[PDB]
Design a protein around this ligand. Structure first.
Ligand code: BCL
Ligand code: BCL
Ligand code: BCL
Ligand code: BCL
Ligand SMILES: CC[C@H]1c2cc3[nH]c4c(c3C)C(=O)[C@H](C(=O)OC)c4c3nc(cc4[nH]c(cc(n2)[C@@H]1C)c(C(C)=O)c4C)[C@@H](C)[C@@H]3CCC(=O)OC/C=C(\C)CCC[C@H](C)CCC[C@H](C)CCCC(C)C
Ligand SMILES: CC(C)=CCC/C(C)=C/CC/C(C)=C/CC/C(C)=C/CC/C(C)=C/CC/C(C)=C/CC/C(C)=C/CC/C(C)=C/CC1=C(C)C(=O)c2ccccc2C1=O
Ligand SMILES: COC(C)(C)C/C=C/C(C)=C/C=C/C(C)=C/C=C/C(C)=C/C=C\C=C(C)\C=C\C=C(C)\C=C\C=C(C)\C=C\CC(C)(C)OC
Ligand code: HEM
Ligand code: HEM
Ligand code: HEM
Ligand code: HEM
Ligand SMILES: [Ca+2]
Ligand SMILES: [Ca+2]
Ligand SMILES: [Fe+3]
Lengths: 280, 317, 319, 258, 60, 40, 60, 60
């Protein structure tokens, strides 16, 4: 099964590892080396995540053990072990499962890599996706490492990983005062401000008023030049966006990292350096 | 504006407060904690006394509290006090050259109260102070006027009428936040309801104001930086008001929130009548007490330094 | 200038393009276009001209009043001491009217200026929305931007119009302050039992996230395909091209399915516009319909269960 | 989301109200996601999904109508497009398997080098002149005050060897920018256009580096009909040729690294 | 309208349509503003004092 | 710029009389208030 | 009249469109930035002293 | 330079400056990584003992 214009693109080659072997397409997907890899992590983890719902906080017969997607949770081991493997039951699952996350995320990127390698397109997507993965490598590896405990990670619970975000947040009082955190936020907002703007314009030029032709880039420019003056540019936005997106994550990564390993006091207070400046 | 990149370095302290992976964790700077302890050390207790001889009220004529004690013990409790309060100005601080019993110098008068004050704490408010207790040092730490004392903060400057907006200024009171920054007076001094977290699922039951919660947040901030910890310490942020979950400390502090009131409402406020100008705030109110006063940025004053135990005169007789 | 279609290596310039001809009644564009080598090294270099009619002028003047009022009071609290002004800027802010006024018009002192500068900022946006509507039809363009901007405005008014007024107190309104407004959202949550359990608030995040996600994909993809002219979406939407012709295959092979060059922009729209949609709601429900989203969740068996390794007593029931 | 409900309230009476609108909007989208491509071609791997179906969850939408501008035709979405051609053989009789390019993959016009037959016309500006044209016609366009001039630089190649020298660059009237480079191949002495996307600069040695194809490949690059304007048809078939290099310019590239 | 004589020359340099819209708008705000800045202070005529309290004879 | 000496001096003149138009109308303004509510 | 001698040559380098427009703005905002700040100041006139509180009288 | 006798051949495969500078960094990141890892707790020569006591004694 291929698209009206797929067949003429399914070329052989452009593989990183053992490509020729797994070099083929299963439905609308691609496999190759990394293709099989990720899968070997998917079920090996996805099922473990289910095994957690099965087992539960204490036991499968317990009253805590539930199957409500909301209440489901897979918390990491205590901070006692630090950088040690805790019993599969007492934190082990999380630890192992997480190792499957990196194997899924990273491979998924690597897989995208050669996938682009075949279409001779740019490696933008993967490189971009890297950040997302990188950000993850911070909320589970980097941070915990400089904190000396794999238990610093976040629980794998649809709603469970929100509390971990509330505590660690208040752990520094009003977590709204974090420099990197603020900055990052701005980006997330700008980004959304960009999408709501980009996507909108396109549809507003290719589907104008009734009895009207498809506008051209000639309009797009003027449009935003008549509401606020300047127009970033066609691909410019596709650049800007990509930027915001990544920047949003980057600055965020920093945001949490600095929180703890590089600062134990309360963020609201950090801003004091600006106050204690010999100028006021 | 700018983004932080590391004013403190790794690996920071760690203290697992809640169940594995609940977010409830304490992270403290290693070095800082060191310096804090070091510079925040007590004073070795004085040598034990004979505890015999005659009684205080026996020989000493003008004694209203330390009577129970003997001479050596009382002479001792007189020494300690001088080293803890005015080790700088000697005994002449709360007395008159010769008149070991005169009550002309205000420093004495208060000292009396302050005495009962302390005792009370150790004798009737043990759920808070525990079997440890507090001494004149805990607050005075060797200074006639406790460094960490407070007063009704005036706020920002007078725009000639619209000045009431007392929530726009980073006061060290609230950990450099932008809250009212003066929760000590309305709470630590008064008794304004701190609770605002609705106890019912749907609306129509709790009339609490949004500003109100900002106020509580205020106080909490201040408290948080007083003991020098993170809310995780007392609670699990997803249950700011569920006690069934929140932390033993949460309650312990509860009592203090009043032990402080007590200390201001029944001891520190009355003495204002005799306290001089430099001891009175702009609003005429006297320097009161706060969690910051004792704790001074340490969950347990002097890191659990048990001083009062070695001083029997510092307990209700 | 690393070329991954990141920075325009070599720029060129042509006579200032005074926009396209507008219809009858629409004032002629104004402003001598400017050129910036640097800025242009990011995207477009030419600047302006800009349109400014009734609605426009009426807007730029309107909201410019609110800003002044705000910045004014800010510099007012600091006792007009710029020194301490640029110092406490973040902290400084125009606080709302005290609860001791409900909705009644307070004196310029106790909350007045806020309200005033508020209505001037409320209409300033509502008016600006029309300003955009006038820039769309004047070019035969559609109103996808207004529709979105509307959605955003919706949530904007939820923070004052529909919710506060529905509560009967100007107290439940965000203040004019960089930092203090952070406390607002900080307090609001605390006041209503933790927005983490608030359904809509979550749904809205899925967008603040999704949004960032998509553009990270799109903005990127278009570039990766910028080689095969993937930036010129317009002529791609009309007559499909090679850019969009591989641009999809990628996603398809990667995630299974995919959409068209046009299609996607539609997803993006609904993934962004729906953000605030789930915003104004999640807040329109809070305070009025619900008061404690935590108990609300567990009420519906949402809130997860955690062992009890730590617990505190309750001096209230005891005493 | 629980299977059984014992609690009722307004908050929840609006939540489902959303999911319905959501489950609906996601479909609205899907429909649109099929205005280019579908129906599929084969059955290599029977459409995968929680619920198979003939052609996806949502039935194909109704053909939209696009009125191009003045002096233009009309486009419909979706549209019944005639089957294309594949200049490659199946690497294996097993479905999904790739198709090996016949002859010189550098010009086999398959995969990386493969490009659809775009309209054999040319894109225009708002008024009607060919949008993308050479500076030899753009009497107004000039190199940004300061930025180094490309016209005159020698276009190097993958292997490193020089392939030719730039004789002019193609600017864009509609959107001020440089989109192509009128390169003058040395071998064939012909004039082929070079796309920005593949065009790299080394202002130090006055060059336009290209890792796409070798210097020799610049020879047989899809020629243009009119040297005073680039046709959309060719335009897309142009920069596509370079793509091949991205995967054919060297046996090592297509070959595995580990 | 005496000085009107020499003032007529302004129309030759500035676009009349501008000074009109700029002002028709400028007054818009000023008006909405004054009643506001005033009603919020000197006399909140609407419901601060006179006439017969809508609260007294009203609420009861 | 954009003009010569002629058109220039003419503008300046009328432009002045219009400026003294203000100062006078504003100074007389201040004075009227100065009498009523004395600042300082 | 003194300086008005050679000050005419000014318009020969400074366009009138410029001055006229900016001037209006400055004098507008500037002015409003006076009744404003000064208003907030003691010599307020709307609700400071007189008219002596009638609100209190008429209201109730 | 014992094994260095036949190890010269490794250069036809590995680029010259490629692994050259590719290691210059490696070293760096390692150095500070180690000055760091060691500093954290084992031996904190900076502040831990003497011949210091400059601030504790000096400041006081
Ligand atoms: C009391 C709580 C505090 C608080 C505490 C914290 C804490 C604590 C943290 C944040 C973090 C973040 N906070 Mg905060 N935060 C607060 C209030 C806010 C507010 C607000 C308006 O009030 C906002 C907008 C934010 C915004 C943010 C983000 C900038 C940041 C998440 C960044 C990110 O992009 O990760 C990007 C993404 C990822 C790491 C995940 C990786 C994605 C992977 C690779 C893909 C998964 C695929 C999956 C398996 C497949 C699904 C498909 C199915 C098969 C169908 N916070 C309050 C004040 N915040 C976090 C942060 O800084 O991170 C850097 C963080 O740790
Ligand atoms: C970024 C800072 C915090 C964090 C803070 C928050 C906050 C705050 C919120 C979420 C929310 C969500 N987070 Mg989270 N989250 C973090 C890290 C993660 C990671 C990760 C791999 O690291 C994952 C997979 C998730 C997943 C999720 C989703 C369940 C939920 C929807 C978000 C969204 O719409 O994104 C945009 C993207 C998409 C819609 C597309 C793909 C996402 C899909 C729908 C989620 C699938 C996850 C699945 C249950 C995992 C198991 C898969 C098995 C194969 C079954 N979070 C870090 C630790 N997260 C929101 C929520 O409602 O939680 C209940 C919310 O409000
Ligand atoms: C401790 C505090 C709580 C919390 C409390 C709140 C509160 C309270 C709210 C949110 C809301 C949101 N939160 Mg939250 N939030 C927390 C933690 C998080 C985290 C996190 C990772 O930890 C994340 C990712 C989020 C994410 C989000 C977003 C989904 C949502 C913001 C929508 C938005 O577009 O705003 C940006 C956009 C707008 C306000 C609209 C724009 C309107 C117009 C266009 C602006 C006018 C322009 C004007 C002219 C500008 C001139 C200015 C003048 C100078 C004055 N929250 C913590 C748990 N969150 C909002 C929500 O939707 O709740 C349901 C909200 O109200
Ligand atoms: C402060 C204590 C006093 C008081 C003292 C003063 C004093 C003192 C002054 C005013 C002035 C003013 N006061 Mg008062 N005022 C008080 C209470 C009030 C109240 C009130 C509701 O209580 C109001 C509404 C006002 C209202 C006003 C304005 C009418 C006026 C501001 C003019 C201006 O800045 O133009 C801004 C300027 C311009 C737009 C441009 C310059 C004008 C030129 C000359 C004309 C333009 C020429 C152009 C090129 C030709 C084209 C024509 C058209 C533009 C198309 N006052 C109290 C009682 N008031 C000022 C005034 O009226 O000066 C005359 C002034 O000096
Ligand atoms: C700066 C980077 C931005 C970004 C970009 C980005 N994301 C991307 C991409 C890019 C460029 C892709 O190419 C890729 C994609 O969609 O490819 C088709 C993707 C993607 N971004 C995704 C999600 C995602 N991105 C996010 C954020 C961002 N993505 C940033 C804004 C977020 C959040 C939290 O806001 C989420 C949730 C996925 C839809 C997809 C990647 C899918 C993938 O590679 O999955 C691999 C693995 C599996 C399918 C199996 C996992 C099972 C494991 C064995 C267990 C792991 C357990 C897990 C850690 C527990 C999670 C529990 C939570 C519910 C608490
Ligand atoms: C309780 C109960 C009864 C349960 C029943 C359970 C049952 C029945 C289960 C059986 C059903 C099963 C097992 C189903 C499994 C389905 C699975 C596993 C799917 C895996 C695929 C997967 C993880 C997909 C992730 C997709 C996600 C989350 C994408 C996020 C971004 C997003 C909004 C994408 C949608 C729009 C698209 C496709 C964007 C990509 C895209 C972008 C970004 C472009 O820029 C672009 C440019 C030019 C042309 C095309 C495109 C393009 O397509
Ligand atoms: C002196 O200043 C100078 C001249 C130098 C200029 C400088 C100005 C500066 C520096 C200004 C800075 C401003 C800043 C930093 C502002 C920051 C604002 C922030 C952070 C705002 C954040 C949130 C604001 C919100 C959510 C506002 C919501 C407002 C609403 C909902 C208003 C509603 C109003 C209504 C409904 C009015 C209704 C009319 C009546 C009341 C009559 O209906 C009964
Ligand atoms: C070492 C120096 C000091 C000596 C020798 C000393 C001695 C004494 C003596 C003998 C008495 C009881 C005498 C009587 O009233 O008849 C007494 C009482 C008292 N002293 Fe001191 N004193 C010293 C320092 C201080 C200081 C620094 C304070 C102040 C904080 C202080 C506060 C008091 C008070 C308040 C009483 C009365 C106690 C009561 O009411 O029961 N003294 N002191
Ligand atoms: C029993 C031991 C204590 C003695 C003898 C003592 C003595 C005194 C004296 C003499 C003063 C007046 C100082 C002056 O201004 O000249 C004073 C003030 C004060 N004391 Fe104590 N005190 C004791 C314990 C405490 C404790 C435990 C606290 C802490 C809560 C405390 C808090 C204060 C405050 C807030 C003031 C007012 C500030 C001031 O007077 O300058 N004192 N104390
Ligand atoms: C900065 C982080 C903190 C925040 C945001 C916070 C917030 C709150 C809130 C909202 C309440 C009111 C709950 C209700 O409606 O009943 C509260 C109460 C309370 N908090 Fe915290 N808190 C923080 C840190 C702390 C810490 C560190 C302690 C411990 C020393 C503490 C002790 C208490 C106590 C004892 C009460 C009950 C007060 C009463 O009797 O009304 N809190 N907190
Ligand atoms: C209202 C503000 C105050 C709060 C919230 C507060 C809170 C607390 C808490 C939570 C603890 C237990 C710490 C732990 O478990 O490690 C504690 C201990 C203690 N507090 Fe306070 N406190 C306050 C004010 C004070 C004041 C004014 C004094 C001074 C006289 C004081 C003296 C002590 C002492 C001596 C201990 C040690 C008891 C022990 O070891 O368990 N506190 N306080
Ligand atoms: Ca506030
Ligand atoms: Ca004066
Ligand atoms: Fe796009």
């Amino acid at each position: 099964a291929m698209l009206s214009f797929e067949k003429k693109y399914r070329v052989r080659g452009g593989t990183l590892i053992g490509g020729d072997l797994f070099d083929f397409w299963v439905g609308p997907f691609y496999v190759g080396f990394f293709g099989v890899v990720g899968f070997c992590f998917t079920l090996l983890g996805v099922l473990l995540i289910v095994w957690g719902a099965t087992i539960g906080p204490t036991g499968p017969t317990s009253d805590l053990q539930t199957y409500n997607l909301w209440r489901i949770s897979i918390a990491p081991p205590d901070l006692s072990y630090g950088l040690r493997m805790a019993p599969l039951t007492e934190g082990g699952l999380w630890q192992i499962i997480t190792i499957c996350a990196a194997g899924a995320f990273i491979s998924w990127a690597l897989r995208e890599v050669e996938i682009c390698r075949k279409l001779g397109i740019g490696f933008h997507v993967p490189f971009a996706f890297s950040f997302a993965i990188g950000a993850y490598l911070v909320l589970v590896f980097v941070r915990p490492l400089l904190m000396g405990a794999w238990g610093h990670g976040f629980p794998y619970g649809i709603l469970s990983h929100l509390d971990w975000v509330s505590n660690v947040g208040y752990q520094f009082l009003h977590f709204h005062y974090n420099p990197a955190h603020m900055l990052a936020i701005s980006f997330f907002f700008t980004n959304c401000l960009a999408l709501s703007m980009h996507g909108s314009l396109i549809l507003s030029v290719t589907n104008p008023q009734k009895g009207e032709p498809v506008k051209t880039s000639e309009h797009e420019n003027t449009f935003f030049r008549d509401i606020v003056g300047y127009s970033i540019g066609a691909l410019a936005i596709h650049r800007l966006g990509l930027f915001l997106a990544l920047s949003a994550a980057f600055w965020s990564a920093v945001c949490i990292l600095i929180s703890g390993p590089f600062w134990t006091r309360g963020w609201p207070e950090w801003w004091n350096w600006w106050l204690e400046l010999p100028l006021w | 504006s700018v983004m932080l990149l590391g004013c403190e370095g790794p690996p920071p302290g760690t203290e697992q407060i809640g169940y594995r992976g609940v977010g409830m964790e304490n992270y403290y700077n290693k070095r800082q904690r060191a310096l804090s302890i070091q510079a925040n050390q007590p004073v070795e207790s004085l040598p034990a006394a004979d505890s015999t001889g005659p009684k205080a009220s026996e020989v000493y004529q003008n004694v209203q509290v330390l009577k129970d004690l003997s001479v050596g013990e009382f002479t001792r409790t007189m020494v300690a006090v001088t080293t803890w309060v005015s080790p700088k100005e000697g005994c002449n601080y709360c007395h008159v050259p010769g008149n070991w019993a005169s009550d002309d110098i205000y420093t004495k008068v208060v000292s009396r109260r302050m005495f009962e004050l302390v005792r009370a704490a150790n004798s009737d408010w043990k759920a808070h102070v525990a079997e440890t207790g507090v001494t004149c040092y805990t607050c005075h730490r060797g200074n006639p006027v406790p460094k960490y004392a407070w007063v009704t903060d005036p706020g920002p400057k007078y725009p000639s009428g619209l000045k009431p907006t007392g929530q726009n200024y980073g006061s060290k009171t609230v950990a450099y936040a932008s809250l009212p920054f003066d929760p000590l007076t309305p709470f630590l001094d008064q008794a304004n309801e701190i609770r605002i977290t609705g106890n019912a699922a749907l609306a129509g039951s709790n009339p609490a104001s949004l500003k109100q919660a900002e106020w509580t947040f205020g106080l909490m901030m201040n408290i948080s930086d007083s003991l020098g910890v993170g809310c995780t310490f007392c609670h699990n942020t997803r249950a700011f008001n569920d006690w069934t979950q929140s932390t033993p400390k949460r309650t312990t502090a509860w009592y203090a929130i009043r032990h402080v009131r007590d200390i201001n409402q029944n001891y520190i406020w009355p003495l204002n009548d005799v306290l001089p100008a430099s001891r009175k705030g702009p609003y005429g109110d006297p320097l009161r007490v706060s969690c910051m006063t004792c704790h001074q940025a340490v969950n347990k004053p002097l890191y659990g330094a048990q001083m009062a135990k070695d001083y029997p005169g510092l307990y209700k007789t | 200038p690393e070329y991954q279609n990141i920075f325009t290596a070599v720029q060129v310039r042509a006579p200032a393009y005074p926009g396209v001809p507008l219809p009858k009644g629409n004032l002629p564009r104004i402003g001598r276009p400017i050129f910036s080598y640097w800025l242009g090294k990011i995207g477009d270099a030419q600047i302006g001209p800009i349109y400014l009619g009734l609605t426009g002028t009426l807007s730029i003047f309107f909201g410019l009043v609110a800003i002044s009022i705000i910045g004014f009071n800010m510099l007012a609290s600091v006792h007009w001491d710029v020194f301490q002004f640029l110092k406490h800027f973040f902290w400084l802010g125009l606080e709302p009217p005290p609860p001791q006024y409900g909705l009644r018009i307070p004196p310029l002192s106790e909350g007045g200026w806020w309200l005033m500068a508020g209505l001037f900022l409320t209409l300033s946006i509502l008016l600006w929305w029309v300003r955009t509507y006038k820039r769309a039809e004047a070019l035969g363009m559609s109103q996808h931007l207004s529709w979105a901007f509307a959605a955003a405005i919706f949530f904007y008014l939820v923070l004052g119009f529909i919710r506060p007024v529905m509560m009967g107190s100007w107290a439940k309104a965000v203040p004019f302050g960089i930092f203090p407004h952070l406390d607002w959202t900080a307090a609001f949550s605390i006041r209503y039992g933790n927005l983490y359990y608030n359904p809509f608030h979550m749904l809205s995040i899925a967008f603040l996230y999704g949004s960032a996600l998509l553009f990270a994909m799109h903005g990127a993809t278009i570039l990766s395909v910028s080689r095969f002219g993937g930036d010129r979406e317009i002529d791609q939407i009309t007559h499909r091209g090679t850019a969009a012709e591989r641009a999809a295959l990628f996603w398809r092979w990667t995630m299974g399915f995919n959409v068209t060059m046009e299609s996607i922009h539609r997803w993006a729209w609904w993934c962004a516009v729906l953000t605030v949609i789930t915003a104004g709601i999640g807040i329109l429900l809070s305070g009025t319909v619900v008061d404690n989203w935590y108990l609300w969740a567990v009420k519906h068996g949402m809130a997860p269960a955690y062992p009890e390794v730590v617990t505190a007593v309750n001096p209230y029931e005891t005493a | 989301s629980a299977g059984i409900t014992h609690y009722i309230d307004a908050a929840q009476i609006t939540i489902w109200a959303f999911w319905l609108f959501f489950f609906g909007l996601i479909i609205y989208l899907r429909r649109e996601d099929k205005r280019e491509g579908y129906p599929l071609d084969s059955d290599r791997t029977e459409r995968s999904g929680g619920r198979v179906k003939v052609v996806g969850f949502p039935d194909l939408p109704d053909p939209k109508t696009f009125v191009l501008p003045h002096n233009g035709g009309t486009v419909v979405a979706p549209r019944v497009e005639a089957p294309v051609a594949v200049n490659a053989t199946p690497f294996s009789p097993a479905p999904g398997s790739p198709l090996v390019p016949n002859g010189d993959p550098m010009l086999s016009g398959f995969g990386p080098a493969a490009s659809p037959d775009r309209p054999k016309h040319c894109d225009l500006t708002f008024e009607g002149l060919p949008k993308i044209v050479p500076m030899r016609v753009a009497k107004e366009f000039s190199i940004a005050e300061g930025d180094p001039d490309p016209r005159g630089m020698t276009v190097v190649g993958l292997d490193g060897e020089v392939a030719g020298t730039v004789s002019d660059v193609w600017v864009d009237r509609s959107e001020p920018q440089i989109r192509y480079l009128e390169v003058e191949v040395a071998a064939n002495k012909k004039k082929v256009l070079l796309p920005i996307g593949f065009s790299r600069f080394d202002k130090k040695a006055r060059k336009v580096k290209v890792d796409a194809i070798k210097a020799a490949h610049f020879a047989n690059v899809p020629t243009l009909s009119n040297p005073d304007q680039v046709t959309l048809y060719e335009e897309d078939k142009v920069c596509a040729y370079y793509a091949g290099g991205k995967l054919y310019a060297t046996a090592e590239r297509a070959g595995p690294l580990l | 309208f005496t000085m009107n004589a020499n003032l007529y020359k302004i129309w030759l340099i500035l676009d009349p349509r501008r000074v009109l819209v700029s002002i028709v708008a400028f007054q818009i705000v000023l008006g909405l503003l004054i009643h506001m800045i005033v009603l919020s202070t000197d006399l909140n005529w609407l419901d601060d004092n006179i006439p017969v309290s809508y609260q007294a004879l009203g609420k009861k | 710029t954009g003009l010569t000496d002629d058109e220039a001096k003419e503008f300046h003149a009328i432009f002045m009389q219009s400026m003294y138009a203000w100062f006078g109308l504003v100074v007389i303004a201040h004075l009227l208030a100065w009498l009523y509510r004395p600042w300082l």
